[PDB]
């Protein structure tokens, strides 16, 4: 996890080869590509409660809000298993209104 100790990018793995009086390291790394821009927010307010992502960031495609993982764009809908709650929505700078979906009660019809 040391930055730039094993090449440029996120180190995946490395292979050694012998040279005359030396060694050659072939570093395999992961390099992110083809980014898009989005709107973002730190928390989400629902029922007077602030919701934070467990892992990921809240992003908006223009009209809807999703959670994604931070390094590869893979959007999902914001549920109570995606997030955790802390406090009320009066203290966070930049909080946004949206609905956080519960699975249990629409299972219970």
């Amino acid at each position: 996890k040391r930055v730039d100790f094993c090449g440029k990018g996120y180190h995946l793995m490395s292979f050694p080869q012998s040279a005359p009086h030396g060694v050659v390291f072939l570093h395999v790394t992961y390099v992110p590509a083809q980014e898009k821009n989005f709107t973002t927010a730190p928390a989400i307010c629902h029922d007077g409660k602030a919701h934070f992502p467990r892992e990921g960031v809240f992003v908006s495609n223009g009209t809807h809000w999703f959670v994604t993982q931070r390094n590869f764009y893979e959007p999902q809908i914001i549920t109570t298993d995606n997030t955790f709650v802390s406090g009320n929505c009066d203290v966070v700078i930049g909080i946004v209104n949206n609905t956080v979906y519960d699975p249990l009660q629409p299972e219970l019809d």
Binding site: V3, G9, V31, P32, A33, E35, T40, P42, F52, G87
Partner: protein, 49 residues
């Protein structure tokens, strides 16, 4: 690690709080105090210099 991708600075500070074991609500609920403390700490360096 590649191309520069923008992110707002308080959200970068929250990632970094996660990287030491503190949840990020602890940053967002203290943002103003944390920024005051950083500013006083930076203002103390030029005084010693």
């Amino acid at each position: 690690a590649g191309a520069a991708l923008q992110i707002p600075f308080a959200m970068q500070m929250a990632y970094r709080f996660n990287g030491i074991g503190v949840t990020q609500n602890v940053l967002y609920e203290n943002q103003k105090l944390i920024a005051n403390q950083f500013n006083s700490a930076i203002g103390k360096i030029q005084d010693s210099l």
